[PDB]
Structure to design on (1517 residues):
């Protein structure tokens, strides 16, 4: 399953060994369980050293918006720069969090994919209940577009237009858009 | 389970519902879907073709169902020349109560222990925010359309109907009369 | 699954399903669970027989575990509305709305066969969701119960209080006990 | 899949399904599990056959595993109520409520074929819920067993005590054993 | 997909194929034997005796058997009625099917050259208390003793031999079934 | 996949990330509230008081709520213990989650700038007799009156306003929740 | 997912799961549905705590919907058997057998938190089969209700008659209502 | 789900699961449905404790609905084989093979707590297939029942005839009734 590594100076699972050097893996669908683990890792690493950079590695299709905002707010709240690196795919809220990294320190590997889209949801019941859920999800999208605007340097209007459908971007296209700063080269 | 009857006028065999239709009675006694709506519409148009002067009688024991199917029946009632009397037996709920109130003025009835339920329309939305936005706007406009027509038929204000249909509202025959959904409570002869 | 019978008169030979044959002699069979389809059949049959003859008695044979309350009331109100006396006969079992409709027959003309069972209960329902939604559903079924007890009081000669108490749990009765209660007038004596 | 028979008749040549053809000669088939649908069919048939002729015998052929007790009593009460003698013939198997209805035939006219099976047992039921609810259903099914045993005592000539002991578990009886018991009167001999 | 056949009269008359065969006193036992099948076969046997008490009846058997009690309903009706019941096996007569094949009128039990015959012991089951399992065992054992007793009388084989021969499934050719005493003749073109 | 963290001592000690946080008096309420979650949270609150009756406890909330009774187990333990319980909403505090957020020590209830807060009425159900439905309705209504009473005291809003505001699902931004009285401060970097 | 606590102790620094840590101070958690597994765990814990110290009080925290009656009586009988006083604290909810065990605590030492719920009701069960089998299960669960009511009478100071009426249907009680009833002794005040 | 306890001696600090801790003091928990896995655990525990000390008593605590007969007999024969007295204590419920094993404990040393239930019954099984296959299965379960009744006769002081009659249906007993029967010697009086 998950391999064990030995350091001379104990036994670590590979993910915990990376955390010792301030690397956090976001490598799954974002639910509350994932979000609370990332949050706790971010807070622990600040408590260890308030000044040294943190590195968030992202291979995620996204998931829950609220779970993603738990991570987003914790990134912005803490003193250290949180560097972000896209490996494989950062989609939806995973791409949102890729863009959330410290300005100048957001990366994607050359063949990594980035996807931007509008939030997904649903409601079943009375017209009033459907009205509430529609107004809530539209306000959630407004909140997402506004932050992405500030993050990428693109206008709210352009982001609305470009996320209307699923938008698949190359690592190059992600830089051009302003979702990342550099394509990390071999 | 559907019984057969014999008439003496030669002689002919009828299923009970076809026999009532002979005397211009239409039965709306199930969940309102497309099949039911198209049946009732065809029945209403046939009875007008036979006689455009004589009254038609729509007996209602229905939990409602599809709003558009209900509206297909509604629009046919209003288009045709004959007065369509409505009679609530057992229960008229949702689109069933809407169609009960759609009967010719002075000619909407309910039996003493019949129940009338009014409610807001039900639906669903899946997918993207804009897809949910369209679905929400559609069902809200559908409700506006329902509330407007009900207002005109009952005499009640649009907002009172908005308030009284927000949650499921169960009314007795007397309460439905007082509300303006019907005109008379049909008492034993 | 229903047998066919052949009938002979001035008009000749006619084939009937057995239930349609009984209907020709003003007998309606209430022999299933009560839903909207059954109710609408009964209602249509009651109205047809009044149109045929508004003086002659109608006969409702009941072998039913009840079912839908609103469906039963569609039958109930139709019985009361039409001019002819509607006799009721319990064969086998009249439970729930079945027993309500048995008590609904014309006074003096309600019967049960010596080994027929009669069951009386309170109405059954359900609610899932918000506290307000549950309140409304509770209030509806309580008012439905009030209506059932009020009518049953008139037909039996018992108080609403006694009916409330006796219907709190499922209450099974013999034919004799149903007669003593006022649900029926007579136990039908064999030949 | 049931066959159609053509018979030359007085009014004219006629096509019947075979079960309806048998009904013409006053034979009713009880050949399935006893539910409310089956019971109401049998009741209608017995009432139709009395209306045609109040004097001539009726013949009820039984190949049934039983089923519903109340549905069985709808058939029982109708048999006893009508004037004509109802003969009972067990073909294949009469079990549970099937065996009860076999025993219910007019005295001297209850038959089983040589290799036919008769099974007698106590009522089956259930209750799930509160202790009060389980008490009611237990008391109800126990009174139902008393009613069945008391009638069986009258019909077979055996004591309630003996029937109680003999029906505690499933009891399979041969045709000759059914005769000795008093469930039937005669084993039907090849003509 | 049961085909309709037409026959001329001094006009014309339509039959489904099976009802047409019954007119010439042929009963088809061509399915698994349950109570529904048994009561149908029993009624046909009784009807055909009523039409003619003298002329032979013909039972055509392509059945894998089924219910034992349903089988005995048919068996006892065959024995009761006065007409001779000829039995013809086409395809397969298994279990209670083969029992009823052997029950045909003496000298009048047939099987087609490639038709198969299977004899076996009765199948059943019980689940519950030891007392319940004992009763169900004693019942099925007595049923087997009843089957073996009659098969002995029909075949000429001893009760002990049939017990041995039916312990497991025994498949017989048409010639073997003749030799055994289950049939009298193999029917040749 | 809960990561292990290592800390130096005058040797070394391993912690799962959540147990490490508890050492500094942080309790994570980051799942649906059931009895298992409640008893875990209750035990942590009681343990931390036992360690130090003076120092603050910190409850971090990312919960969609769940059970009301399980929620009140946590609520009553917060009130009982002497230490001030600070509440911080990350991501979402919904239903009983938002109730427990509002239950934090006065002046010490927080939410992050993009964290969402949802208030609603309690959910339930009953299926059976009218008597059974009445009891279950009266019980859930009384539970709501209990929730609204406490929320009134915590927020400053009237019992009547909260009733109106929780009739349907009400989604609040971190700023709106502050203004409402559910939290005291929006936590800024 | 349950947290691990590190505590400095006399023998040395030690890692505990939080529930085992509480047990060290003589606290047992009853925080799930009561089945045989839960019951045997509680029994073992109560016996272990007597063995360590026969004099010092034990504390049973209850957040339980109830469950099995026999499993509940394994816990009840062990509480009464041991020498130490067993204090009971209702946190969140004590329902059915949960409320019974709350009432079972040493007199003067039964508590509920201000917003904690207490529910009392009659036993739940079932039977499916013969009339004899249903009789046995009905008589068994009725005797079980008598046993529970008789003990509750002793514990709360109310009559068997009152308990019978009050537990017929589900009865939800506030902490203060539980105190007036005598199920608990005290509502636990914020310190 | 099982709590951990820390123990102190000459050998220091040791952490135990609560059931392993009880086993150190020669207590075996029989607190589940009896299958082969449970039986093999009990058998291994019994043999280990004899190896440790062949004089000191062993204690078997029983909270069990029974299960497999052969599994129970593996435990039974192991109890009888080993030299130490094996005391039995019924907590909550000993039903079926659970009650058999309760009666299996050393004479004079079988206990039940005042509210513990004891149930006795006949063994349960099934058979599907040929008449010969059903006969064999019937004969096996009947002989299994003979063996159970014969042993229960010795341990209780009742006749095989009385045991056969009393075990025909599910028979529930109080602790006192179990003592009167000879299944246990003593009802365990509280402190
Ligand atoms: C090994 C474990 C280390 C745990 C680190 C937790 C931490 O840094 N929490 C953030 C809040 C937070 C939680 C979250 F989930 C997501 C976020 F983005 C942010 C925090 O408040 N940090 C404080 C320092 O720690 C605290 O002061 C105390 C004890 C610490 C164990 C827990 N605490 C708090 O949670 C409270 C809420 N924080 C405060 O009391 C102080 C003062 C009030 C405003 C919040 N706060 C601070 O903001 C303090 C002073 C400003 C610096 N300042 C922290 O860094
Ligand atoms: C025995 C079968 C009788 C069927 C009756 C159909 C009928 O009355 N249709 C309505 C339209 C309609 C359909 C529906 F589904 C729901 C509705 F509410 C209304 C109708 O058009 N009625 C006409 C009479 O019939 C028609 O003229 C012709 C032939 C008739 C067989 C079918 N037709 C039409 O469907 C068309 C659409 N109608 C017309 O052609 C004429 C002229 C154009 C406007 C519609 N129309 C009429 O309105 C005529 C005007 C003369 C009065 N005027 C009807 O009653
Ligand atoms: C061969 C088919 C015969 C169908 C018989 C229907 C019938 O008797 N309906 C009841 C209403 C009713 C329906 C129901 F479902 C359950 C009920 F309990 C009662 C009825 O109204 N009966 C009338 C006679 O019939 C009617 O006058 C006309 C035509 C008849 C085919 C249909 N109609 C009505 O449905 C309307 C509603 N009835 C009336 O218009 C008249 C006058 C307004 C009050 C109701 N009404 C009558 O009550 C008339 C005069 C009083 C006698 N009086 C009926 O018996
Ligand atoms: C071809 C259609 C034939 C229909 C025959 C029905 C019939 O005979 N019902 C039994 C009752 C009954 C029903 C049942 F389901 C199971 C039973 F066991 C018994 C019956 O009452 N028979 C009467 C004759 O018929 C009736 O008098 C009238 C009309 C008949 C169509 C229907 N009716 C009744 O149902 C009513 C209830 N019966 C009566 O009115 C008379 C007088 C009141 C007591 C019952 N009753 C009779 O008992 C009459 C006189 C005594 C002879 N006496 C019948 O045989
Ligand atoms: C077109 C429809 C033709 C229907 C043929 C029915 C018939 O033949 N029944 C067998 C009994 C039987 C039923 C069954 F399901 C399986 C069997 F194997 C046998 C019968 O009894 N046949 C009698 C003639 O018919 C009857 O006498 C009367 C009317 C007939 C419509 C029905 N009945 C009987 O069912 C009764 C039971 N039979 C009798 O009453 C007489 C006298 C009592 C003993 C039986 N029985 C006869 O055995 C009579 C006299 C001996 C000749 N004898 C029949 O052939
Ligand atoms: C490392 C483990 C720490 C365990 C902490 C348990 C604790 O604080 N329990 C609360 C009760 C409680 C339980 C719960 F689940 C939710 C709650 F909100 C509250 C408690 O009672 N605390 C006492 C101190 O502890 C106790 O006195 C004893 C031993 C402690 C191990 C367990 N006990 C009790 O549970 C009993 C019930 N408490 C008391 O006996 C005393 C006196 C009676 C009233 C309750 N009580 C107190 O309230 C005492 C005195 C007031 C201070 N006062 C506690 O702080
Ligand atoms: C750390 C491990 C501690 C284990 C403690 C078990 C224990 O106390 N069992 C209770 C019985 C019991 C079990 C149960 F599950 C629920 C209950 F309610 C009660 C018990 O009997 N306690 C004894 C002390 O322990 C025992 O004497 C011996 C060894 C102990 C390891 C196990 N034993 C017993 O189980 C036997 C049955 N008990 C006895 O032998 C003595 C004498 C016979 C009557 C029972 N008994 C006692 O009752 C002794 C003397 C009275 C005090 N008296 C205990 O407290
Ligand atoms: C620390 C592990 C201790 C394991 C204890 C096993 C044990 O006591 N087995 C019983 C057999 C048995 C197994 C079982 F599953 C359920 C039972 F009820 C009984 C046993 O045989 N016990 C012997 C002692 O042990 C043995 O001698 C040897 C080694 C022991 C590790 C295993 N063995 C046996 O299994 C064999 C079968 N036993 C014997 O060989 C001797 C001689 C042949 C007859 C059986 N037997 C004994 O009966 C010996 C001498 C009499 C005393 N006598 C045991 O107590």
């Amino acid at each position: 399953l998950i391999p064990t590594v030995i350091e001379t100076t104990r036994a670590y699972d590979i993910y915990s060994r990376l955390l010792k050097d301030r690397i956090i893996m976001l490598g799954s669908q974002i639910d509350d369980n994932v979000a609370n683990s990332i949050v706790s890792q971010l807070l622990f690493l600040q408590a260890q050293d308030s000044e040294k950079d943190i590195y968030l590695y992202i291979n995620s299709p996204g998931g829950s918006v609220t779970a993603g905002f738990a991570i987003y707010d914790t990134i912005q709240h803490i003193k250290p720069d949180v560097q972000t690196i896209c490996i494989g795919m950062a989609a939806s809220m995973g791409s949102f969090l890729l863009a959330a990294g410290a300005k100048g320190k957001r990366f994607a590997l050359p063949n990594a994919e980035v996807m931007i889209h509008q939030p997904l949801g649903g409601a079943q019941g009375q017209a009033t209940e459907i009205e509430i859920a529609a107004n809530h999800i539209l306000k959630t999208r407004e909140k997402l577009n506004r932050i992405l605007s500030e993050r990428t340097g693109q206008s709210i209007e352009k982001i609305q237009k470009d996320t209307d459908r699923d938008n698949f971007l190359t690592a190059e296209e992600a830089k051009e858009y302003g979702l990342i700063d550099e394509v990390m080269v071999p």
